[model samples]
Target chain A: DLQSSFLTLLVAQLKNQDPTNPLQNNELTTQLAQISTVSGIEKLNTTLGAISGQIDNSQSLQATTLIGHGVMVPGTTILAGKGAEEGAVTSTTPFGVELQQPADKVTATITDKDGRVVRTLEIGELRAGVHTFTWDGKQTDGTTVPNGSYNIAITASNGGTQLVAQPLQFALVQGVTKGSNGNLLDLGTYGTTTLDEVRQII
Target chain B: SSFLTLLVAQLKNQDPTNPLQNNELTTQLAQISTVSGIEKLNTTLGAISGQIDNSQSLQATTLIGHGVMVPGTTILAGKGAEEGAVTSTTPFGVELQQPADKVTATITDKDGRVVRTLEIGELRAGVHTFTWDGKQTDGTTVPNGSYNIAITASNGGTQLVAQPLQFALVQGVTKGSNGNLLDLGTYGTTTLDEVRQII
Candidate 1:
């Protein structure tokens, strides 16, 4: 739009020039060059607008397919289930479980449907790797445990001292819901995850 | 030869009534040319500024309905529940501010029973989130509808303090007679007329 204005001004200048001595060839060339530069800028702006429109439309269209699929998100925070209950856990690392620190003692507490602590498995020092431990659904007193989520707590200590221990859990990827702005993932219950955090589609 | 000599002598003895210097005339012409060049440059710069302004206006027009975040003292409430995070750590537990934090959390159900109470006490600061599974503590799934999340903070004992910090996505940009304004998601609109940064 402004380019048109520039052209108008240039034409007006040319029309009002003295007839006795018209504009020199060099001056005329410079003026034309300025006009050409302005025109190029205007063309670039139009191109940018087109590209932006295409990107927005494509992203919005692609997002619809993710509505009902379960996706795995790579996360670090683990929830502690009720005593003796079991929770899901996942890792992005393909092999080997890594602990935040060397564990002094590792134990798995299994619980039954009654929310009663059943058996405590004495897992000795564990090497760094990803692993899953299942309870026979028995308690320390040797009783048949109820069916429920088993809680796993690994206590890592140095020497005779206790170190800070953390538990890890895996969450199911409920169908992807739109984030507050329709551009993010709304992970049910487990919390929200971004597109980049999604590691698997199982 | 005699005629040529007589002509030259007459030219030399001409009256000074209409005198003109060759160098002076040349200098006057040069000055006029310089003034014309400067005037052309001025016109070009004015045109460039106008173009830039137009581009800015066009860019502003595209932000409508786009979620945006802005800084404000006012707190918005009663918009459809949306998820939010603390995104920062404090000495105490994580805190949530205003309507932005009103995540449609599954806390209770239609039968009028408490379902899942997201014990904020267990959460640490720095981006913790939750989703309502449409169930209450009694495990009954409720109908889908807008819900509000009531937030509070304690120091492990019993002192409740007010925690206020909010961030929202850009909803859109609007142009008023004054200037361009950014519509903060569910919060409110703030203009470059009052904003320090767009992000």
Candidate 2:
């Protein structure tokens, strides 16, 4: 509307200008430049509005494939891919925890919803890498555990030094939400990953 | 033309009968100032953002070939042997990555006998060091070469996985939007803040 109105005014000036004396060059140039500047700003606003959606759509498309599988996003927690069914944990997805270096002895204790130690397994001597361990859903006692979210507590020892082992988080990317900030991957059993921190070990 | 210079030209050429009035001149000056300020501010911020994006990467390149210890959930302490050494010089340590309601660490001799109970009380998520002075629970030194460890920590209510502090060397460093991230070979990415020590 501003552009059109400016054009109308310019046209009126062009027509009403005396034959011997026309609108001055300086006035004409300024008016036209003003109109162009306004138009540029209007177009810039539109571009800004469209840019966010384009980025999110592209990122969200890549995120959806992460469903049905799990990755360890940037955080202390990991994806425990499979969920538990009944009293027995049908999640045999083998949540392997990664180590920084070779430990003399490595032990992983699976905890249940109540923060109680469920099953502790000896990963033996491990070099620095992702080491896989399977929890049969059994507790320290040979009883089955109820299905729920469980966390891992691992300690890898090297002589007098004991280090923390990162348990492989087994989780599937259930869904994604692209916001102005960044993409978010919803890990069902665990929690969610914040924007700019969505790194996964696919 | 720049705002004021163009205005001067317009004023010089306007019809003498209505030569740019004082009111119009004042208004035009303000208009030019506002628009110029907006454009200048835009360009200033745009340049600042460009610097952030470019510098983050340029500064990160130095870490490409070097190794650093960021936080990772793994270990490689057994360099000398599979079970590692138990010398007093090369003492071992454990880290409570999270607060534990109760914690216990025991050193055992090769025969699986409890050599010493190193920790007995509660500890917050922090790292602790220990060495094998060849001391036993009975305060006697055993003629030991290598010993083992059995430790467990928990909050007692929630299912907790208590892993010790794991370390990994950086394969590369990437400038994440948040900060520089360390790429640990197979261990994935770790933020620089997660690294308690720089080695």
Candidate 3:
């Protein structure tokens, strides 16, 4: 130790030097304090190294649990495709809304990429709660709309008042990749989204 | 002064036999330096954090009194007429989806008479609010009543669709757990990205 070496040298020098008299210098105690501080910092560096190692293995391992669990990320655009029978287009997109009160009438308009109102799904007066609807990918005249990207707008009104409805895009979390940009969950046909955009995980 | 220089100075003034060992002094001095460097770095990070907070607060302040156009079609009525108070003629804003080869906006009354033909010009692909100045094609101010706007734009020999526009007065601001939110009155809270145009 640096402190011990300094003290040992001082002791020998004092023993040999002053047969007449000796004054004890505080140098030994001061050096002891210096060495203590340095050693403490060295221990801190070692602990910092150990903690960083734990984080790498532990953080990556924790993310692996979310590998196959499907998540609902924030998005509006959905693909409308062919369904089971002819004259049909379908999407498994769990599109719906929860109403605070019964709506006298509700309309859901589906628009294509060109902003053309391809289909309008309407519902008459009903009690409020969770409401669901289905789309059978057919146009107004029994024509099957081509499979492509489409946008949905749902509006609800109680005879005299308007109500708020939030539209959501439902897709599965297919893969997880940890990259320099950040962690991303792959949505197969829905495309990719970052961790921040995952509105819900179900 | 540095810890190394202090240690070296003490050694130079020491009883020659009581000097700190050469390699031991070097190792311990470097430890002191690393500790000091970490302290300085922590202090710098703290300063940067404070600066970011101040910038955020300043940004929120600038949005307090202004008009921001968000995406909605239900242009609210009951804005213009009040007893004995003067009001300026407000302009209607429109957002274009594609660059238009030519555009026409046919302002009409509820009974459906064309009120004004606002001249068209080259516009970019974004939200835009226009000023009609409450004037008609015949250069006259019409009756004072709740109004509406209809716009048509064509691009590259094809008709293009423009998204419906909504305007809201920014009254105040708030910091929610999510982030800054502009109070858009009955239009509700609006996010920064939702604000397409700050007119």
Candidate 4:
């Protein structure tokens, strides 16, 4: 419909040209062909691009719905308590590790922002697979760790050789935004990651 | 305006015997206007779509960090303040399908014992919430852990539809292809449509 309307107007305008050179100008004929062809192509391209934009926005809207839900992702940040307020860690937060193979010894080392070792948890032995654990937010002296973001490193070794281990953590989706790469999930104190990086939706 | 300008130029200098027809000239002008109108319509549609997306996202975000009651039966209560002290239990609700002459809700212990019978009286067809307060029928406090709730209703001696609602903290929301889903932390998933009341 739009293409036909555009072509009709172009033809009408060309007919009103100077009578001496009317319909005899080669440049005018070339421009008419170019305008008709280019308009047709661009109109189709614009419609297709609009449809694609709609689908892209639909995906971004879907990501927004995931906010407030817990998701497991490859990370090491452990939230001690309600991260908004500065308080003592009154409860435990769930985190985990993915062991590539069966290991005899596994220890989770919790470090603060300044890289100081605040607490160490001996998770003992574990079979190969993804497993979740909780940090009671206590140091060796039983003092509560302040509510904040802390890093956890899981080290697993079978007798002597160290086994490849991946640190996993839980994060609540706080916000979603279109990043330079793709949709970025804001995890608050747990940090941020791409939506594809999410391991599991809890 | 440019189309009109071109049409005037064509009219003043056209061949005396081959002048443009009135119908054709009017049609060309209308066609050009229609083309621009369609372009404007597309831009407006894009803006409207973006606004709708923004409004939907804002609505979902407001539900974060709040407790919502949906269709469920189980309830959870915390440990008492000690010495059988009274501690507020989990909040629950009853969803009535229609106006009822009478409605009642019962909180049962883990062993299926009726710990408390709550007489809800008359209620309109809607959602209503209440707190347990951890008090049993015999003046005893409910201990910590999970309990189940059952609701019953009747209208003029005939059974009416009544559902026991459970409480869950709103942890987050997830937008799905069909609709938006609310995340209830360990309580599993539920949609906003399933929510009966926000506490």
Each candidate's clash count: 40, 39, 2, 7
Fnat for candidate 1 (0 to 1): 0.00
Residues A46-149, candidate 2, lDDT per residue (tens digit)?
A: 65546545544544445443334444443223223334554334444345555566787778777766777767777777765454445666667776655565
- Ranking, lDDT, top scorer first: 4, 3, 2, 1
Docking class of 3: incorrect
Q: What does candidate 1's lDDT look like per residue over B91-171, in tens digits?
A: 111243322322222233334354446554433333333333444466544344333334454444444433323334554
What is the Å distance of residue B60 in model 1 from its true position?
39
DockQ of each: 0.01, 0.02, 0.01, 0.04
- State the C-alpha lDDT per candidate: 0.43, 0.55, 0.62, 0.73
- What is the per-residue lDDT of model 2 for residues B1-199, given as tens digits with 9 covering 90 to 100? 5766776667666888767754356446646656765675576556556445434543444554444443332222233344655434124445566777766656666667776776545667776544445566897645535555666676775423544443345554433334556656656666655554443
The 10 consecutive residues of candidate 2 chain A with the worst lDDT sum are A73-82
**Clash pairs, model 3 backbone:** A89-A137, B93-B129
lDDT of 3 by residue, B76-129 (tens): 323255675433344456688678767777777656778777657667787777
Docking model 1 quality class = incorrect
Q: What is candidate 3's TM-score against the reference?
A: 0.38
Could you estimate the TM-score for every candidate?
A: 0.35, 0.34, 0.38, 0.52
User: How far does residue A6 in candidate 4 sit from its true spot (Å)?
Assistant: 20
